[PDB]
């Protein structure tokens, strides 16, 4: 989740809580408020892709 597309060669390590709707979150991580840092499901039994 991010407000705007990243400018080339720009790194964004900020972990602020994303506000998808119209209610500001203020760091609560609840309904319509998400944590952008999604993990990866890396296991040896995955497919090639």
């Amino acid at each position, epitope marked *: 989740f991010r407000k705007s597309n990243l400018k080339p060669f720009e790194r964004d390590i900020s972990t602020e809580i994303y506000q998808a*709707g*119209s*209610t500001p979150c203020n760091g609560v991580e609840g*309904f*319509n408020c998400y944590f952008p840092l999604q993990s990866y499901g890396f296991q040896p039994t995955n497919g090639v892709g």
Partner: nanobody
Framework: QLVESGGGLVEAGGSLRLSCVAS????????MAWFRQVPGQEREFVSH????????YYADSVKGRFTISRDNAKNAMYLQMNELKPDDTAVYYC??????????????????WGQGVTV
């Protein structure tokens, strides 16, 4: 996205007119609302208008005072006040959505939100 106009200091008993203009929405298959902001407290609901204006609801503390209307010829709707009590001086927010909801009082049921009117 939702540019709105109107607002200002009032004579505490006169009338005022507020507008909210959609610049990137068809406005013919969308449903809007009016919500109120007060510092130090949560967001409040005031008014709501459906498609065209044939099914409109109002808050229990505002019923009978303010009138809502919409017109597709300019992609905007008009909210007119008639009392302007010295207790309703707050921040005005214009919302919109594709459809109308049964939980139309909930703020989460309005994906689109506009700018703010003068406090």
């Amino acid at each position: 996205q939702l540019v709105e106009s109107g607002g200002g200091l009032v004579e505490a008993g006169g009338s005022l007119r507020l507008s909210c203009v959609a610049s990137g929405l068809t406005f013919s298959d969308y449903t809007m609302a009016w919500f109120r902001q007060v510092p130090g407290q949560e967001r409040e609901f005031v008014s709501h208008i459906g498609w065209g204006g044939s099914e409109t609801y109002y808050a229990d503390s505002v019923k009978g005072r303010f009138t809502i209307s919409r017109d597709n010829a300019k992609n905007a709707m008009y909210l007119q006040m008639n009392e302007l009590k010295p207790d309703d001086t707050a921040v005005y927010y214009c919302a919109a959505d594709r459809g109308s909801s049964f939980y139309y009082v909930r703020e989460s049921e309005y994906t689109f939100w506009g700018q703010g009117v003068t406090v």
